[PDB]
C-alpha cells in the first residue's frame with residue numbers, strides 16, 4: 001500500500017529538494033511546472049507510475065520518448081535528472097524515480113497556485129520501457145469523448161470525475177498548432193471549422209495558427225490564466241473556448257451527459273475542483289505501482305541499474 005509518509009525517516013527533505021529545483025527552473029522556464037505534471041501523467045498511463053517514461057533507448061527496448069504522444073512534445077527530462085541527483089546526494093539510493101516524478105508533479109501544481117497535499121509514496125522503478133504500450137495507451141487530442149473515456153478506463157480510471165478533473169491539467173501549459181489545425185480549417189473532413197469552437201476565439205486561434213503556417217508554434221491551453229493552476233479551464237469550456245477537441249468534448253459531446261455537470265461544478269467552485277483534482281491525481285498515481293522489492297530504486301532515471 002502506498003503511503004504519504006514513506007520517506008519521513010529515510011529522506012524527510014525530499015519534497016523540499018524537489019520544490020527548490022522547480023522554483024529555480026521556473027525562473028528561466030515558466031513552462032516547466034506544466035511540463036512536469038504532464039510527464040507524471042504519461043508515466044502513469046503506461047504500465048503505471050513506474051518511471052518507465054524516463055528510460056532512454058537500449059538495444060533491447062525502445063524508449064517511450066519516441067511515442068506519438070511524447071516525441072517532440074514531452075519535455076523537462078534534464079530537470080528531473082537535476083532533482084534526482086540532488087536527492088541522491090541528500091539520501092543515497094532511497095527515493096525512486098517513480099516517486100520523485102510523482103512528488104515533482106504535485107509540487108509543480110502547488111507552485112503554479114494549485115492545491116497542496118502529500119502524495120502517497122512507495123513506488124518503485126521499472127526494469128524496462130514500453131513504447132508500443134505508450135502508443136496504444138496515451139490519449140490523443142482528436143479522441144471523441146467515448147474514446148477519451150475508453151482510454152482512462154483502460155488504465156484503471158473508471159470515473160468520469162477522473163477524466164474531467166484530470167483534464168484540468170490544461171489550466172496551464174502549451175499546445176502546438178498542429179493539434180488544432182483540423183478544428184480551425186477542416187474538421188472531420190467537413191471543410192469547415194469545429195462548430196463547438198467559439199467563433200470569436202476561432203479567429204484568434206487562426207491568427208496564431210494560419211493554414212500552412214508553423215505547425216510547431218505554441219499556443220496556451222488556458223486563454224484566461226496561461227500559467228496559473230486554477231479552475232479557469234472549465235469556465236473556458238462553458239463558453240466553447242476549450243483549446244483542443246478533447247477539452248471541448250467534455251462539455252459539448254453528445255455523450256457528455258455525465259461530464260457536463262462535473263465541468264459546471266468545477267467552473268463554479270475552485271474548492272470543488274481542487275478537491276476533485278487531488279482525489280483524481282492520487283487515483284492516477286495509484287495505477288499498477290511496483291512496490292516492496294519489485295523493480296528497483298533507479299540511481300540514474302535514464303537507465304536501469306546494472
Ligand code: HEM
Nearest residue numbers: 034035038041073139140141166167169173174175176246
Ligand atoms: C484527457 C486526454 C488528454 C489529451 C488528449 C491530452 C493532450 C495533450 C496535448 C495534445 C498536449 C500538447 C502537447 C504539445 O503540443 O507538445 C498536452 C499538453 C499538456 N497536457 Fe494534456 N492531454 C490529456 C490529459 C492530460 C492530463 C490527465 C494531464 C495531467 C493531469 C495533462 C497535462 C498536460 C499539460 C500540463 C500540458 C502542457 C505541457 C507543456 O506545456 O509542456 N494532460 N496534452
Ligand SMILES: [Ca+2]
Nearest residue numbers: 043046048052
Ligand atoms: Ca510508466
Ligand SMILES: [Ca+2]
Nearest residue numbers: 171222225228
Ligand atoms: Ca489557468
